[PDB]
């Protein structure tokens, strides 16, 4: 039915550790408006989970699709 | 091919404003391990974008699916 599309940019990735000492990568995605950026999604992924997704590098453009009962985050086409 | 599934819980929603004075809701999703929680996704959505998704309330269980070139975030079944 309805759908919203957000163009995101990966501005930051940082290695962090929980109390288990399990490693995650904190990935910050912002939207550009006007020229400023607002945060839109921050993900914390293990190194495995990132491999599964594919490349998600700083400077990459990310599509965030919001529809009824689903948010999808994909690389740009 | 490969796929990773994360069970998330919405622990927090907070009203915030960018410099445009545009309203977003900051939504924090954590994973339970052991008993502790680690952050997994933080989303900033306008009130419209949230309507499109459906209900996303504090205490709700969220599935995060990671596959090649896509992360999907859906309500629990």
Numbering used by the authors:
A (entry chain A), B (entry chain A): -1 to 32, 71 to 113
From the paper:
In addition, we show that crenactin interacts with two of the arcadins, arcadin-1 and arcadin-2.
